[PDB]
């Protein structure tokens, strides 16, 4: 987001937007025909009114959605991960269900959930995207932006930010010299890394100390430890 580059149409078909009251608030990703994944932090205290959430698929530009590529959708059921406390900011994953199935096309693709016994060593480049602000004091009203950030270990993250209970359920990423940090604005953006011509899901955007500050890596929720929970009701 911050310091990134503008993306083209169809670059990331699995990135979808979520609206609430006519304003963009949080991001989401497509998992199956009628399921979505998003950070549980942004969807909190609003789970009693599912009808007020509007789902947009194939979102590329915020100018007008009259083009035959945006399919409006509504959320029928919202599921929040039981292991959440809003104190340690640990395990914030939420699941959203669409009212009707959406046919797969060229501009609509799902994400590939990681399997068990998969190890991603630090230092591998992974891509990020979102519609968040880029000036840290404004908003973004343009096409989707993309950027690439390295991977950092848990010990390095604890050493750089000794102010939170990092534990082993969190993923940290970001350059040591700063410059690019997509933890502001869009907190529902997915963390995507590829493996031999197939893009998987690596993490879910979470809280952060402050974007672009040196030695301030981001926070992302682990997905390999929640694959079974998602597949339980993936259907």
């Amino acid at each position: 987001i911050v310091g990134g580059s503008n993306a083209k149409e169809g670059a990331w078909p699995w990135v979808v937007g979520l609206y609430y009251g006519g304003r963009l608030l949080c991001g989401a990703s497509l998992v199956s025909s009628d399921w979505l994944v998003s950070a549980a932090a942004c969807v909190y205290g609003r789970n009693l009114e599912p009808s007020k959430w509007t789902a947009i698929l194939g979102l590329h530009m915020k100018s007008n959605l009259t083009s035959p590529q945006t399919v409006p959708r509504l959320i029928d059921e919202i599921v929040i991960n039981p292991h959440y406390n809003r104190r340690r900011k640990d395990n914030a994953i939420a699941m959203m269900h669409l009212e009707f199935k959406v046919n797969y096309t060229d501009y609509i693709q799902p994400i590939c959930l990681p399997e068990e016994n998969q190890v991603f060593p630090p230092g591998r480049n992974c891509s990020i995207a979102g519609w968040g602000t880029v000036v840290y004091q404004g908003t973004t009203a343009n096409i989707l932006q993309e950027a690439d950030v390295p991977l950092l270990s848990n010990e390095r993250c604890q050493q750089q930010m000794p102010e939170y209970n990092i534990t082993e359920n969190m993923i940290c990423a970001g350059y040591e010299e700063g410059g690019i940090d997509s933890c502001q604005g869009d907190a529902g953006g997915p963390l995507m890394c590829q493996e031999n011509n197939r893009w998987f899901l690596a993490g879910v955007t979470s809280f952060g100390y402050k974007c672009a500050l040196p030695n301030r890596p981001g926070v992302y929720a682990r997905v390999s430890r929640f694959t079974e929970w998602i597949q339980s009701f993936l259907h």
């Binding site: 149409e9 169809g10 799902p110 893009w199």
Partner: protein
């Protein structure tokens, strides 16, 4: 010299709540002051104790707060781990909350403005309050508690009352990975193979579809390692599959399938080529 006018500032550090632990004899309670308002920037925790093996049912007689800045959290743990259970906020009546443990935690979080009346609770204890009546006459136990002798277990219809019996009686015994394993089917109570003597590619594709996977990749048999109650599977004119029980048979062969992974998020978009 003093810039601040001689008026009392808010000056409300910490929480300054109320009672923390209660028991059965006292049920109804209000947070701070139900008739008028509650203090801002407060965080009070109530612990509902109960006898071992008994559930707790909570009800609210009145519940009128603000918008969404203030929320109420109910947890069944607060010892080593807890679950969000149910969270209610905003004006309007709320439903009762059931807990599977013998200890319930209630939390209140408020902002610095927009004080409201508050809420009052209704403490009730019992046995299996959130669990429906167990099934009788050896009927099938469903998710919603409905009892039916035999209208389920992967029948060729949806006669079950719930209508959500989408589970399939197919699983990989032993195997080498998730996508590789011996195919077994359970007609009524016993899992067994499908007699791949007349196995074809269409049957493999149908089986892979039933397992939420791709198409038929490999269908090479090895030998009948298991001596289970073999039943016969054969093609049908329609889109279904017919499984004929043919137990007590010799000269058979098992099924070894490796269904390909489903198509997923590969960048199949016809991106233009930049002449640079």
């Amino acid at each position: 010299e003093p810039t601040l006018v001689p008026t009392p500032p808010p000056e409300l550090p910490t929480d300054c709540g109320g009672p923390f632990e209660l028991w059965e004899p006292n049920t109804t309670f209000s947070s701070t002051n139900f008739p008028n308002s509650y203090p801002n920037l407060a965080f009070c925790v109530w612990i509902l104790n109960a006898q071992k093996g008994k559930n707790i049912q909570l009800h609210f007689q009145e519940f009128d707060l603000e918008n969404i800045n203030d929320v109420v959290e109910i947890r069944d743990g607060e010892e080593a781990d807890s679950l969000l259970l149910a969270v209610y906020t905003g004006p309007g009546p709320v439903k009762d909350v059931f807990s599977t443990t013998n200890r319930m935690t209630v939390l209140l979080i408020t902002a610095d403005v927009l004080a409201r009346g508050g809420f009052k609770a209704n403490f009730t204890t019992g046995y299996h309050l959130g669990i429906p009546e167990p099934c009788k006459a050896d009927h099938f136990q469903c998710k919603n508690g409905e009892c039916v002798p035999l209208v389920n277990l992967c029948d060729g219809h949806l006669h079950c009352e719930d209508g959500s019996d989408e589970a399939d009686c197919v699983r990989f015994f032993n195997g080498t990975t998730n996508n590789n394993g011996l195919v077994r089917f359970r007609i009524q109570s016993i899992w067994h193979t499908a007699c791949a003597e007349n196995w074809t590619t269409q049957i493999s594709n149908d089986v892979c579809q039933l397992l939420g996977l791709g198409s038929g990749n490999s269908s090479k048999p090895i030998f009948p390692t298991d001596g289970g109650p073999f039943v016969k599977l054969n093609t049908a004119p329609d889109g279904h599959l017919i499984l004929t029980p043919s137990q007590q048979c010799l000269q058979d062969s098992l099924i070894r399938l490796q269904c390909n992974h489903k198509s997923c998020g590969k960048k199949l978009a016809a991106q233009d080529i930049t002449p640079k």
